[PDB]
Amino acid sequence: HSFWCHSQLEVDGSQHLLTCAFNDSDINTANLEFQICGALLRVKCLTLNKLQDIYFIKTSEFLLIGSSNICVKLGQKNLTCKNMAINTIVKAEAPSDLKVVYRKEANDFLVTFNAPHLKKKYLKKVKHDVAYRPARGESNWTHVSLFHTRTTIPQRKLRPKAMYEIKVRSIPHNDYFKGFWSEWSPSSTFETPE
Amino acid sequence: YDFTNCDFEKIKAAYLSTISKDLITYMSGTKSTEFQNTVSCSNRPHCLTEIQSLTFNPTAGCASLAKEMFAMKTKAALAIWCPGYSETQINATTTNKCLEQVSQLQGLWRRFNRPLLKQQGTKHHHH
Amino acid sequence: VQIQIIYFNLETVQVTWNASKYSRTNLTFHYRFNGDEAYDQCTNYLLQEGHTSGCLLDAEQRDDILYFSIRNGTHPVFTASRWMVYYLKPSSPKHVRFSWHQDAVTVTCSDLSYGDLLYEVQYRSPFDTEWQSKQENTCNVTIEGLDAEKCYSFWVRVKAMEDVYGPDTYPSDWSEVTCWQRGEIRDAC
Ligand SMILES: *[C@@H]1O[C@H](CO)[C@@H](O)[C@H](O)[C@H]1NC(C)=O
Ligand SMILES: *[C@@H]1O[C@H](CO)[C@@H](O)[C@H](O)[C@H]1NC(C)=O
Ligand SMILES: *[C@@H]1O[C@H](CO)[C@@H](O)[C@H](O)[C@H]1NC(C)=O
């Protein structure tokens, strides 16, 4: 019954989201519930809501200070409990609005995107990972590490008269909030000149 | 309570991560310059003493800030990182006066982050 | 009464005022620090058009609440009390140096004697529409992913951190603008 959890901050308000699921997806989750206790503002515990193969809770109860016990329960029996802090399991939200503009004057491509964490109250420092490769055939992705929402790709670095695929992801970089890479953004494509 | 046994660096991390932001949310819409600054503090233990007082000791006009999210986090940080703080906890229980008082808290928390800056509280040379 | 407070580089506090009503007069400035109950009068006045317009206090790197009052003789016209560091203006970055490595640069400078500051480097090539920026806790900012083949204009400044000093501080003035193409200094860009 081993499991994982991740938190996401200020999702649809001042409310945070906690998501958990079993490592083994071939598990009959019949009557198994997830309960989080501790590090909550007004209550001792919260029970997560099941949706197909995942469990979640959207709430404002998290203190974001101190550890919580997350338990897999069958009735009142604890099958497995793990202690973890909501502030150390933060999955960043994926960037969006990825755009590439070819600048002939500069002999480069200007890449821009929107970083949702910048609009949040907490966690205002994330590291971005931009990946690109030709849209046709198999290639090892070229990765660019950034701390801002723009980068340039010099023309000389890309093959001419070719179509490229580009995507981006983010991870918390903060001395308090720690966690996981976001999912990749949807991919954008662009064409290189002669 | 004596705030000299606190993990100040851990408390500082908690302030900068979330508490600072929650105080700003509470004060939203007020002019920075709108409240006169009246409450001061010196060292980190003294600042925590004054933060303690203003956040949890009930004043007149502002009966309770204790239920506020910034206060609940402050109580959480002090219970985790100040040993014997929860063993000394007393076990029984927006106004234009609360905004004044929260403005005072913001200054103390900020002063808690400047412990190395000198003040009028002087005379300390040695051998 | 309109007022301005500047705490220059944690050295000097300057409080300036203007009030058209009290033009035919010298308004007096009285101050004290926290606890030091009796007010003292200003011993360093700024004048404008022959009349008092400000005061200079030697603050000697001290972080306190300055309590002050401006008076039309005995009658107080304006009274306020503010944490002095809230009006901090750090000094301009000194001894700014650049070290290049292929498509990267490391900008260093003399750090100030006080903490919780952000040393910001702004840069652009003629192809950029706005200044791009990178900042750090110390004056050692590394900007990777640039183009050795392009000319870049650069300038540095010091800001106080809002979480520690509050929102009303002043950034330092920017240091001298320098131009760089292929790891060598240039005149124009
Ligand atoms: C408050 O309650 C808890 C549990 O009863 C106890 O540990 C704590 O020390 C009490 N406070 C005082 C001052 O006795
Ligand atoms: C002086 O008054 C004018 C408006 O009359 C204002 O623009 C200026 O900033 C005031 N000076 C100070 C020190 O704020
Ligand atoms: C105001 O003070 C200046 C000197 O600081 C002096 O020249 C002037 O006569 C004074 N004005 C009045 C109203 O006395």
Side-chain angles (χ1 to χ4, degrees), chain A residues 1 3-11 13-25 27 29-31 34-41 43 45-51 54-75 78-81 83-90 92-98 100-101 106 108 111-118 122-123 126 128-131 134-135 137 141 146-147 149 151-152 154-155 160 162 168-174 176-177 179-187 189 192-193, chain B residues 1-9 11-30 32-66 68-74 76-92 94-95 98-117 119-122 124-127, chain C residues 1 3-20 22-23 25-36 38-40 42-47 50 52-59 63-71 73-81 83-93 95-96 98-101 104-126 128-129 131 133 135-143 145-146 148 151-175 177-179 183 188-189:
Chain A
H1 307 268
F3 65 99
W4 59 258
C5 294
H6 62 237
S7 61
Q8 297 176 80
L9 306 178
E10 308 168 65
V11 169
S14 66
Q15 307 216 296
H16 307 310
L17 182 62
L18 172 65
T19 310
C20 307
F22 292 104
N23 285 323
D24 187 333
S25 59
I27 197 176
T29 67
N31 301 332
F34 277 69
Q35 181 178 63
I36 181 161
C37 302
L40 314 175
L41 161 52
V43 298
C45 303
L46 293 168
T47 302
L48 282 57
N49 305 300
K50 194 180 186 300
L51 174 58
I54 70 96
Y55 297 87
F56 75 90
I57 183 112
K58 176 175 127 176
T59 179
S60 283
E61 291 284 347
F62 307 135
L63 275 157
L64 302 181
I65 305 164
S67 297
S68 300
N69 291 335
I70 298 169
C71 292
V72 172
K73 301 177 80 179
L74 173 63
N78 294 306
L79 297 185
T80 178
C81 295
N83 183 254
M84 68 189 86
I86 297 287
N87 71 281
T88 68
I89 58 165
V90 180
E93 280 180 354
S96 64
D97 310 321
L98 183 58
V100 182
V101 181
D108 74 10
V111 179
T112 61
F113 54 100
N114 284 323
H117 84 115
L118 292 177
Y122 322 109
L123 189 46
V126 307
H128 307 290
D129 175 24
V130 173
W141 295 88
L146 313 170
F147 288 95
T149 60
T151 191
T152 59
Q155 189 169 343
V168 57
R169 62 177 186 170
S170 313
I171 194 167
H173 183 72
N174 190 281
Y176 185 76
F177 292 106
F180 311 108
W181 283 108
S182 75
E183 284 303 301
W184 288 100
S185 67
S187 299
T189 55
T192 65
Chain B
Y1 162 67
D2 170 19
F3 290 87
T4 81
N5 312 314
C6 300
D7 192 325
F8 300 116
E9 281 304 304
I11 289 158
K12 191 214 199 159
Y15 176 66
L16 298 168
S17 294
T18 65
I19 302 166
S20 56
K21 330 278 192 49
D22 293 353
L23 287 166
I24 292 178
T25 314
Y26 187 81
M27 297 299 295
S28 205
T30 70
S32 31
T33 62
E34 172 123 70
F35 288 104
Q36 295 302 347
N37 298 120
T38 55
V39 186
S40 187
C41 66
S42 55
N43 54 10
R44 303 183 121 186
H46 183 224
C47 292
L48 291 180
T49 288
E50 294 297 322
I51 285 156
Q52 168 60 35
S53 180
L54 267 73
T55 307
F56 306 111
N57 303 351
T59 87
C62 201
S64 60
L65 290 172
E68 297 294 328
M69 208 202 186
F70 71 85
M72 285 321 232
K73 291 191 187 194
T74 297
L78 298 174
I80 293 166
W81 293 301
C82 296
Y85 168 84
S86 338
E87 292 91 308
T88 49
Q89 175 70 62
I90 291 161
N91 295 306
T94 292
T95 294
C98 290
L99 291 165
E100 183 285 332
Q101 210 177 292
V102 169
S103 120
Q104 304 304 301
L105 276 170
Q106 283 188 301
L108 299 166
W109 272 115
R110 281 163 185 168
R111 175 57 204 174
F112 171 90
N113 285 258
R114 305 187 306 253
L116 293 179
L117 310 184
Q119 303 187 313
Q120 297 294 313
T122 197
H124 37 38
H125 281 191
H126 55 74
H127 304 285
Chain C
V1 192
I3 287 274
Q4 171 136 356
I5 307 170
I6 317 171
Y7 195 179
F8 293 106
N9 202 33
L10 264 193
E11 292 165 8
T12 315
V13 176
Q14 184 192 79
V15 181
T16 52
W17 62 82
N18 64 38
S20 55
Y22 313 93
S23 60
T25 325
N26 279 333
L27 294 176
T28 181
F29 180 97
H30 309 267
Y31 71 78
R32 61 173 250 195
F33 303 102
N34 35 255
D36 299 351
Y39 284 80
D40 266 50
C42 186
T43 52
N44 193 339
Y45 278 92
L46 299 175
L47 311 187
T52 58
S53 67
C55 184
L56 294 168
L57 315 158
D58 310 4
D63 179 9
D64 276 306
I65 295 184
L66 170 74
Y67 303 73
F68 65 80
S69 71
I70 298 149
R71 310 172 188 171
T74 74
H75 303 97
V77 180
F78 182 95
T79 296
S81 46
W83 282 101
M84 296 181 270
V85 297
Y86 277 4
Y87 300 94
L88 176 66
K89 184 183 188 199
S91 62
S92 189
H95 313 108
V96 187
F98 304 74
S99 300
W100 292 82
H101 190 260
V105 57
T106 303
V107 192
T108 55
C109 86
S110 298
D111 266 35
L112 299 182
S113 50
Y114 48 105
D116 305 289
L117 316 176
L118 286 169
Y119 299 82
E120 182 192 3
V121 177
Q122 262 184 22
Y123 57 98
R124 66 196 299 172
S125 72
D128 290 325
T129 55
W131 291 97
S133 168
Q135 66 192 11
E136 291 297 346
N137 287 327
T138 60
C139 214
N140 180 350
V141 174
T142 63
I143 300 151
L146 299 190
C151 170
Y152 286 94
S153 309
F154 287 91
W155 62 359
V156 194
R157 73 166 174 196
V158 193
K159 298 190 286 194
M161 287 179 70
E162 284 196 52
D163 316 291
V164 179
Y165 296 101
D168 316 299
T169 80
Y170 310 81
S172 78
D173 296 330
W174 294 101
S175 60
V177 181
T178 63
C179 306
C189 204

